[PDB]
Structure 1
Amino acid sequence: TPIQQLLEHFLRQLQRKDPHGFFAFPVTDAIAPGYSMIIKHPMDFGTMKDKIVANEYKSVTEFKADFKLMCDNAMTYNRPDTVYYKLAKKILHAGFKMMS
Structure 2
Amino acid sequence: GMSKNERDTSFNKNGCLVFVSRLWDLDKLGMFHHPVSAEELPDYHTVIKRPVDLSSIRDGIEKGTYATDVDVQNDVARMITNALEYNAKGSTWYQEAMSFRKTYLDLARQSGLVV
Please give the TM-score of this superposition, normalised by the length of structure 1: 0.92
Q: Per the alignment, in what secondary structure is the counterpart of residue 21 of structure 2?
A: helix
1:1-100 alignment, distance < 5 Å: 2=6, 3-100=12-109
**Structure 2: segments with no counterpart, 5+ residues:** 7-11, 110-115
The Cα of 1:13 is off from its aligned counterpart by 0.7
The Cα of 1:19 is off from its aligned counterpart by 2.4
1:70 partner letter: M
The Cα of 1:31 is off from its aligned counterpart by 1.9
Greater share of helix: 1
Deviations 1:53-81 (A, max 9, x none): 11011211101100001000000111011
My pick for the range that moved more, 52-61 or 66-75, is 52-61
2:107 and 2:25 map into 1 onto residues whose CA distance is 12
2:58 and 2:107 map into 1 onto residues whose CA distance is 18
2:48 partner letter: I
Once the two structures are aligned, what percentage of the paired residues are identical? 24
Please give the TM-score of this superposition, normalised by the length of structure 2: 0.81
Q: Per the alignment, in what secondary structure is the counterpart of residue 46 of structure 2?
A: helix
Q: CA RMSD in A?
A: 1.3
1:46 and 1:98 map into 2 onto residues whose CA distance is 17
Q: Extract structure 1 runs of 4+ deviating beyond 2 A.
A: none
**Structure 1: segments with no counterpart, 5+ residues:** none
Larger Rg: 2
2:80 and 2:38 map into 1 onto residues whose CA distance is 17
Number of aligned positions between the proteins: 100
